[PDB]
Ligand binder design. Structure first.
Ligand code: R28
Length: 266
């Protein structure tokens, strides 16, 4: 379906402010002004490094993602470089959000985020799509009660500390290895943005995983919640929970939020 992806001219969008920078490229805050519309849509713009060699085929797939908890590719600008246009999420990423609001985040917010992230991942799995880079930094906040998974499709700088053990050792990526990354993302949220395995070099992560060591229990987590994270990090990938079951588990817990998370002043 070609029309779901808009091909933009360079005159249609302007870059206003830098939001983040890395080896991938740069993400800008900008404005999209389609020619005959007289509207100014706030957008985020990611300019990829020059190719030196297909990604339009992946762009159409990213444009067809149709779920309230996964970011959709709004448009693409094809020159020597490739620039991706998406809706601006005005509250930033969930990683920065839980760090800045570490004092006043209730259990209902946290468990609802876990549900929405699982809903987005379950949608991707039903489309037979693997994300490969699920992390708290890659969950964006449209509104505090509405989050979206971003950066889907960029895979087609290794995020070792979020990867399943079989991804580190065998470079095997499946939906069950996404579940492992989901467990680390939830651990990031429950610790209000702590760095996983802080201090340990990335070259030693596969070793400590092989010895049975996992991320510690967050203090606000009852054992009921922590055992869900623990099951996401089982070596046998098929034993890990499925995103379908994670939606059901966290939905039941979001109905009685104080029973499952112990937060000061909740
Ligand atoms: C976790 C770091 C972060 O995301 N910081 C951030 C994010 C945003 N909002 C926003 N909106 C859309 C997109 C996006 O879809 O980009 C696609 C790839 C075009 C992004 C975004 C996505 N990736 C992969 C990023 C990497 C780095 C930076 C942003 C993105 N982000 C805003 O909007 C204001 C700000 C923001 N920073 C400045 C943090 C806000 N401070 C107030 C903390």
């Amino acid at each position: 379906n070609q029309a779901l992806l808009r091909i933009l001219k360079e005159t249609e969008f302007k870059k206003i402010k830098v939001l983040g920078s890395g080896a991938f490229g740069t993400v800008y805050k900008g404005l999209w002004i389609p020619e005959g519309e007289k509207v100014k849509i706030p957008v985020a713009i990611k300019e990829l490094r020059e190719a030196t060699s297909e990604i339009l085929d992946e762009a159409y797939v990213m444009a067809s993602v149709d779920n309230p908890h996964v970011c959709r590719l709004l448009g693409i600008c094809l020159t020597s470089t490739v620039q991706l246009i998406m809706q601006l999420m005005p509250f930033g990423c969930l990683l920065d959000y839980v760090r800045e609001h570490k004092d006043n985040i209730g259990s209902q917010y946290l468990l609802n985020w876990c549900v929405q992230i699982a809903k987005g991942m379950n949608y991707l799995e039903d489309r037979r799509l693997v994300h490969r880079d699920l992390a708290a930094r890659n969950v964006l906040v449209k509104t505090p009660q509405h989050v979206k998974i971003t950066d889907f499709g960029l895979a087609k700088k290794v995020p070792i500390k979020w990867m399943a053990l079989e991804s580190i050792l065998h470079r095997i990526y499946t939906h069950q290895s996404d579940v492992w990354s989901y467990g680390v993302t939830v651990w990031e949220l429950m610790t209000f943005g702590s760095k996983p395995y802080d201090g340990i070099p990335a070259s030693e992560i596969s070793s400590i995983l092989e010895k049975g060591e996992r991320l510690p229990q967050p203090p606000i987590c009852t054992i009921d919640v922590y055992m869900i994270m623990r099951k996401c990090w089982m070596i046998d990938a098929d034993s890990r929970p499925k995103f379908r079951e994670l939606i059901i588990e966290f939905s039941k817990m979001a109905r009685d939020p104080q029973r499952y998370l112990v937060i000061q002043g909740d």
